[PDB]
Design an enzyme around this catalytic site. Structure first.
Site, PDB file in Angstrom:
ATOM      1  N   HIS A  53     -40.448 -24.222  41.148  1.00  0.00           N
ATOM      2  CA  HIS A  53     -39.552 -25.092  41.909  1.00  0.00           C
ATOM      3  C   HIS A  53     -40.250 -25.896  43.006  1.00  0.00           C
ATOM      4  O   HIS A  53     -39.665 -26.828  43.560  1.00  0.00           O
ATOM      5  CB  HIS A  53     -38.378 -24.298  42.498  1.00  0.00           C
ATOM      6  N   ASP A  98     -39.762 -18.680  37.369  1.00  0.00           N
ATOM      7  CA  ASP A  98     -40.200 -19.595  38.420  1.00  0.00           C
ATOM      8  C   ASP A  98     -41.692 -19.479  38.740  1.00  0.00           C
ATOM      9  O   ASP A  98     -42.079 -18.932  39.773  1.00  0.00           O
ATOM     10  CB  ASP A  98     -39.353 -19.322  39.663  1.00  0.00           C
ATOM     11  N   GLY A 187     -40.463 -22.876  53.268  1.00  0.00           N
ATOM     12  CA  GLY A 187     -41.883 -23.097  53.470  1.00  0.00           C
ATOM     13  C   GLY A 187     -42.703 -21.943  52.912  1.00  0.00           C
ATOM     14  O   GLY A 187     -43.918 -22.072  52.729  1.00  0.00           O
ATOM     15  N   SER A 189     -41.953 -20.419  49.920  1.00  0.00           N
ATOM     16  CA  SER A 189     -41.936 -20.496  48.453  1.00  0.00           C
ATOM     17  C   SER A 189     -43.311 -20.665  47.829  1.00  0.00           C
ATOM     18  O   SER A 189     -44.150 -21.409  48.341  1.00  0.00           O
ATOM     19  CB  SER A 189     -41.054 -21.656  47.972  1.00  0.00           C
ATOM     20  N   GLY A 190     -43.521 -19.985  46.705  1.00  0.00           N
ATOM     21  CA  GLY A 190     -44.790 -20.082  46.003  1.00  0.00           C
ATOM     22  C   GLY A 190     -45.827 -19.120  46.539  1.00  0.00           C
ATOM     23  O   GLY A 190     -46.838 -18.858  45.880  1.00  0.00           O
TER      24      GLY A 190
END
Lengths: 239, 58
Positions: A53, A98, A187, A189-190
């Protein structure tokens, strides 16, 4: 992999500032201007794993070896992205699967502050209750991002307990953690959710989604790496 | 203009920090906001130009 040259010191909303360079695989994904939009994890010198995402493109850059994003003098590695490998099974509706892989144009130079996190085996079993850690430059208050890298220890949650809140929104390639006084936030995410496997920090999850207000009493949801690692190994082997 | 142009910006449940544009009927301009990365509503554009061409004057 999984062994920081600089040992982290433990004890993101309600997290704490990390020891500089103690999470060497943590990278910052930024646009061409240097704007941080997502985190990521180095899995080797030429590849970074992050969330699908995050929508990374070859115009974005991978910043390794960073601690203080507000420091202009701090030495870091701005790495160009050669190609983006988004898992074709990523479901933009349910947010399942994801995960995305980033192949660097130029390899990162590993060092005391830059190295890789270990990847689990598809059959690995990280028991609920296990204390793991997540890191990132996401909001510390649900507002601008903190300059310095943050960290937080949090427990993995059983699917049954996670579902007590999120119900059927929890899919097979998701794993929950948190609801313990801390929370990943915009911020983050990932970024990584790591747990120790025989002493080495291993990537168990990738920050994905959760409370829309970053509530610390709600389960955070991460992409379940054990369910996606075969796709990872296959992608690397083919590229 | 589409009614979705009158909806406040929607960050969503994902935790990214992606800059997007939304039309603000109160000001008559498209402004930036932080998008989480998933489940975007329609008043969410990748450029101010796209936003103005779709929602301008709403």
């Amino acid at each position: 992999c999984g062994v920081p040259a600089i040992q982290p010191v433990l004890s993101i909303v309600n997290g704490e500032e990390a020891v500089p360079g103690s999470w060497p695989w943590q990278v910052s994904l930024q646009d061409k201007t240097g704007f941080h939009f997502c985190g990521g994890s180095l899995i080797n010198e030429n590849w970074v794993v992050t969330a699908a995402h995050c929508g990374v493109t070859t115009s974005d850059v991978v910043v390794a070896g960073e601690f203080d994003q507000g420091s202009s003098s701090e030495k870091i590695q701005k790495l160009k992205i050669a190609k983006v490998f988004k898992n074709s099974k990523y479901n933009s509706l349910t947010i399942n699967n994801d995960i995305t892989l980033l192949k660097l144009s130029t390899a990162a130079s590993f060092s005391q502050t830059v190295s890789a996190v270990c990847l689990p085996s598809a059959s690995d079993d990280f028991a609920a209750g296990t204390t793991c850690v997540t890191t990132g430059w996401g909001l510390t208050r649900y507002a601008n991002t903190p300059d310095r890298l943050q960290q937080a220890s949090l427990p993995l949650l059983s699917n049954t307990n996670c579902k007590k809140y999120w119900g059927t929104k929890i899919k097979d390639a998701m794993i929950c953690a948190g609801a313990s006084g801390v929370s990943s936030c915009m911020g983050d995410s990932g970024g990584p959710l790591v747990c120790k496997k025989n002493g080495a920090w291993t990537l168990v999850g990738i920050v994905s989604w959760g409370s829309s207000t970053c509530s610390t009493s709600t389960p955070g949801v991460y992409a379940r790496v054990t369910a996606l690692v075969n796709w990872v190994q296959q992608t690397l082997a083919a590229n | 203009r589409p009614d979705f142009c009158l909806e406040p910006p929607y960050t969503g449940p994902c935790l990214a920090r992606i800059i997007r544009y939304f039309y603000n009927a109160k000001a008559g301009l498209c402004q930036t906001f932080v998008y989480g990365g998933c489940r975007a509503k329609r008043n969410n554009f990748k450029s101010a130009e796209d936003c103005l061409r779709t929602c301008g004057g709403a």
